[PDB]
C-alpha cells in the first residue's frame, strides 16, 4: 500500500515547469505520510515536501514541512543576503478528549514574506497578509471552561512587520443559571502582551467581569435586562520610547472599572397572507435595545488588541464598538430593528428582510479617538444596516446586505449574490462586493488611504459556473473583475474527465499575485497543470482559486 503516486506536473510563470513525485507511506492505521520531491526549474532545485497525517486520542492533526535548500530567483533578488534557502512549517491539530480536554494547534512559519506568492497554495495563500501561530489547551464542562493559549503572528508586510503577541492568555468562564429569577455569569482573563520590537510597550493585563441578567419571555414578547461590571488592571513596562515621541504619556499602572447596563426587547407580530399566497404566514419582529456605558479615559493604555467592528444588522445590537479589552467606548444609545419573515405552506421560511439603525444620545468616546471620519457628526442616527435572503425555488436563491454610515456620509459596505444550483456538479452563481474608499480611510491604517493598491476601495463582480457534459466531464469556470480598475482580479478554468479507474483534471488560473512598487501595476500569475488520480470533482475545482466558491443556495 506504500508506493509511488502517479506524478503531477504544472507550468507556471514563477517556477516555470514544475514536477511532483509523490510517495505515499502507510505507517500505521492511525498514521500516514507522504514525501514529495517537487522539482522547480526556474529556481533550479527540488523542494522536499513532507506531509504527516495522524489520528490519535488527543485528536486529528496534519504536519507539513517544505524545504528548498537553495533558490536562484531569491538569490538574484537578494544578492547581499546571507542565504537563499526557503522553508515552510505547518502544523494543524484539532481534537477533544474525554469530552472535556480541548486541544487546538495552528502553527505556520515561513522563511520570508514572499513564500506564499512564490510557491503552492495548499495551506497558504498569496492573499494572506500574515501567518498565524496559535496553541490552545482547554478544559470545558457544562458550567465552566478554562483555556491557556499562545498567539503569535508573522506579518508579511515590509512597511511595518511589528505585531503584538499574547504569549500567555487565560480564559476562565463560569455560568450559574437559575439563581432565583436571575441568571449569572463570570469571565476572567490574564494576558501578557509582548512586541517583536525592543522599543514598543509591553503589558500584562488582568480582567474580571461579573454579569447578571434577568430574562422574561412570553409567547410574543421577550424582555431581557443585563448588568455587567468590567474591571481591568494593566501593568505596562518599556514605555520610555513611546513617551519620548508622543505627547500622550502611557502609565505603568491602569485600573479601569466600569458598569454596563443593557436592555433588550423584542415582539413577534403575525399575519396570514391570503391574496398574495394561500396559507402563507408573515411575521413582523420589532426589536429594541438600550445600552449605557460610562466614559473612562484610555489615553494611558496602548491599543494592543482593540479594533473597530463591522456593524451588520446583527452587529447593530452588539454592545461593543471595539474588540478586545483596550478601547471600551462610552455608550448612550438605542437601537431599533425590524425583521419580516415569510413562511410557506410547509412552515419553511422562504424569505426574510431586515433593516435597523443606531441612534446615539452622546458621542462614543474612548480617550484615543483618532478615527478619520469624513464629517463631525457625533450624536443622532449614525449607523444603518439591512439584510435580505430569498429562496425563490429549490434550485434558485439570492442574498443581500448593506451598511450605511452618516459619519462616512456613504455606504460603508455592501454585498449581493444570486445562485442557481441543481447539484454539486451543475450550478451557476453571481456575486458582488463593495467597500467605499471612505470606509477604507476610516478603518484601515493611514498608509492604506494613500497607497494606490488600497485607497480606491473594493468593487468586485464575480461569476462562477459548473456544467457537466455526458455525466463524465465537468466544465468549471470562474471570473472575478474589479470595476474601478476595470481589470481582472482572478480567473480560472478546469476540465475533469472522471472514469471508474482514473480521473484526469486540467486546470488554469490567472490571479493577482502582488504589486510592483516601480511601475505601479499589479503582477499576475498564470498556472496550467494536470492532475491524474487513481463524483466529478466539481467542488474540489471550485475551491482551487484564491476566491473560492461558496454555496449560497
Amino acid at each position: 500500500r506504500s508506493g509511488f503516486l502517479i506524478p503531477n506536473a504544472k507550468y507556471t510563470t514563477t517556477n516555470y515547469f514544475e514536477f511532483y513525485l509523490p510517495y505515499y507511506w502507510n505507517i500505521a492505521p492511525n498514521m500516514d505520510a507522504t514525501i514529495t520531491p517537487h522539482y522547480m526549474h526556474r529556481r533550479g532545485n527540488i523542494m522536499w515536501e513532507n506531509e504527516f497525517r495522524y489520528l490519535s486520542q488527543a485528536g486529528a492533526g496534519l504536519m507539513e514541512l517544505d524545504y528548498l535548500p537553495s533558490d536562484k530567483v531569491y538569490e538574484d533578488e537578494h544578492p547581499n543576503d546571507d542565504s537563499s534557502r526557503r522553508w515552510l512549517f505547518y502544523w494543524n491539530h484539532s481534537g477533544v478528549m474525554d469530552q472535556v480536554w480541548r486541544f487546538n494547534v495552528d502553527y505556520t512559519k515561513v522563511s520570508d514574506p514572499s513564500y506564499f506568492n512564490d510557491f503552492d497554495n495548499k495551506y497558504g495563500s498569496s492573499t494572506d497578509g500574515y501567518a498565524t501561530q496559535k496553541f490552545s489547551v482547554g478544559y470545558a464542562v457544562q458550567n465552566f471552561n478554562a483555556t491557556v493559549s499562545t498567539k503569535q503572528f508573522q506579518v508579511f508586510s515590509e512597511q511595518n512587520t511589528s505585531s503584538y503577541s499574547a504569549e500567555p492568555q487565560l480564559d476562565v468562564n463560569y455560568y450559574q443559571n437559575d439563581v432565583g429569577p436571575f441568571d449569572t455569569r463570570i469571565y476572567g482573563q490574564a494576558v501578557h502582551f509582548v512586541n517583536t520590537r525592543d522599543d514598543m510597550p509591553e503589558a500584562t493585563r488582568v480582567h474580571l467581569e461579573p454579569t447578571i441578567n434577568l430574562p422574561l419571555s412570553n409567547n410574543w414578547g421577550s424582555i431581557n435586562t443585563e448588568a455587567k461590571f468590567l474591571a481591568t488592571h494593566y501593568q505596562q513596562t518599556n514605555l520610555d520610547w513611546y513617551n519620548s515621541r508622543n505627547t500622550t504619556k502611557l502609565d505603568e499602572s491602569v485600573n479601569r472599572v466600569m458598569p454596563q447596563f443593557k436592555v433588550d426587547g423584542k415582539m413577534v407580530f403575525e399575519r396570514d397572507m391570503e391574496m398574495l399566497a394561500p396559507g402563507y404566514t408573515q411575521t413582523l419582529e420589532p426589536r429594541a435595545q438600550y445600552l449605557y456605558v460610562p466614559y473612562r479615559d484610555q489615553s494611558d493604555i496602548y491599543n494592543y488588541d482593540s479594533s473597530l467592528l463591522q456593524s451588520d444588522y446583527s452587529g447593530l445590537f452588539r454592545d461593543r464598538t471595539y474588540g478586545g479589552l483596550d478601547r471600551i467606548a462610552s455608550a448612550n444609545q438605542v437601537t431599533t430593528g425590524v425583521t419580516s419573515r415569510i413562511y410557506d405552506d410547509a412552515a419553511v421560511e422562504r424569505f426574510n428582510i431586515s433593516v435597523g439603525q443606531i441612534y446615539y444620545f452622546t458621542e462614543s468616546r474612548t480617550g484615543d479617538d483618532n478615527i478619520t471620519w469624513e464629517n463631525d457628526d457625533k450624536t443622532g442616527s449614525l449607523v444603518w444596516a439591512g439584510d435580505t435572503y430569498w429562496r425563490i425555488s429549490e434550485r434558485w436563491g439570492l442574498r443581500g446586505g448593506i451598511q450605511y454610515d452618516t459619519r462616512l456620509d456613504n455606504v460603508a459596505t455592501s454585498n449581493s449574490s444570486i445562485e442557481y444550483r441543481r447539484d454539486e456538479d451543475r450550478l451557476v452563481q453571481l456575486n458582488y462586493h463593495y467597500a467605499s474608499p471612505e470606509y477604507i480611510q476610516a478603518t484601515l491604517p493611514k498608509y492604506y488611504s494613500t497607497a494606490e493598491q488600497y485607497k480606491n476601495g473594493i468593487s468586485q463582480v464575480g461569476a462562477v459556473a459548473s456544467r457537466p457534459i455526458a455525466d463524465r466531464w465537468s466544465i468549471v469556470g470562474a471570473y472575478y473583475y474589479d470595476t474601478n480598475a476595470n481589470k481582472q482580479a482572478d480567473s480560472m478554468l478546469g476540465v475533469q474527465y472522471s472514469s471508474c479507474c482514473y480521473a484526469i483534471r486540467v486546470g488554469y488560473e490567472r490571479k493577482l499575485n502582488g504589486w510592483d512598487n516601480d511601475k505601479q501595476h499589479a503582477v499576475y500569475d498564470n498556472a496550467i497543470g494536470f492532475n491524474i488520480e487513481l463524483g466529478l470533482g466539481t467542488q474540489e475545482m471550485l475551491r482551487s482559486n484564491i476566491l473560492p466558491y461558496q454555496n449560497t443556495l
Binding site: V148, P168, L170, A190, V191, H192, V194, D198, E202, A203, T204, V206, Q235, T237, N238
Partner: peptide, 14 residues
C-alpha cells in the same frame, strides 16, 4: 509571588 507566565518577562527586569 512569581506569576512567570502572566507577567512582564521581556523587558521587566530592566
Amino acid at each position: 509571588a512569581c506569576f512567570w507566565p502572566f507577567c512582564n518577562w521581556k523587558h521587566g527586569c530592566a
